[PDB]
């Protein structure tokens, strides 16, 4: 599912 951040929604 990753180490990402931002962009949901």
């Amino acid at each position: 599912s990753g180490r990402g951040k931002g962009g949901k929604g």
């Epitope: 599912s1 990753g2 951040k5 931002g6 949901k8 929604g9």
Partner: antibody, heavy 111, light 107 residues
């Protein structure tokens, strides 16, 4: 609407175990990692680690290696935080999330 | 393994004004910093990620800039609902929150 709903407030004695739930809706649970964050009374946010919601593999910050366990129930889109052998100093509000966040679960550990 | 020094720890500013918060990382974090708003009784709200990108639904009066070890975050046109504690978060190598900035509106 993206929503994370955490279980209600907890009152425990030192040495007991607690398991807090974080139920996701409005987005695909297994497409985003779930992070856990601690806020002790009067203190700032402290990152505890994350769980990969596609594999179940947890990663813990150093201060949360040992008594802390992240787990999943993928079929219920629910992430869990279990704390074993509770300590007074685990008294805090715990948040799950990544971009969006649960409302917090307040834990009080007292004898 | 990355320390984040957030400044100032608290501030007051007038309605309609603009404030800037800074965070200094102990090593280059490659623009992987985010900024959060946090109000008592609620979960944190993500405002800015990858240094300057706005979360969907967040007004453009929130902004961020930076590179290397030095990052900044601004709120312009301050309004009463901006009362909160703001945090930076590096996510280049594990995650680390800054110590927070408590914002007071000077009415």
């Amino acid at each position: 609407q993206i929503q994370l709903v955490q279980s209600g407030p907890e009152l425990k004695k030192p040495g007991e175990t607690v398991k807090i739930s974080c139920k996701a809706s409005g987005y695909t649970f297994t497409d985003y990692s779930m992070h856990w964050v601690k806020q002790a009374p009067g203190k700032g946010l402290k990152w505890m680690g994350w769980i990969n919601t596609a594999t179940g593999e947890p990663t813990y910050a150093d201060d949360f290696k040992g008594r802390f366990a992240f787990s999943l129930e993928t079929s219920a889109s629910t992430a869990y935080l279990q704390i074993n052998n509770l300590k007074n100093e685990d008294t805090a509000t715990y948040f799950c999330g990544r971009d969006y966040w649960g409302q917090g679960t307040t834990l009080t550990v007292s004898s | 393994d990355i320390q984040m020094i957030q400044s100032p720890s608290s501030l007051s500013a007038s309605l309609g004004g603009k404030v800037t918060i800074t965070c200094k990382a102990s090593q280059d974090i490659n623009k992987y910093i985010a900024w959060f708003q946090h109000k008592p009784g609620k979960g944190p709200t993500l405002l800015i990620y990858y240094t300057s990108t706005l979360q969907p639904g967040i007004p453009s009066r929130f902004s961020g800039s930076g590179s290397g070890r030095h990052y900044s975050f601004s709120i312009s046109n301050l309004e009463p609902e901006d009362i909160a504690t703001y945090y930076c978060l590096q996510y280049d190598n594990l995650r680390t929150f800054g110590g927070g900035t408590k914002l007071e509106i000077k009415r």
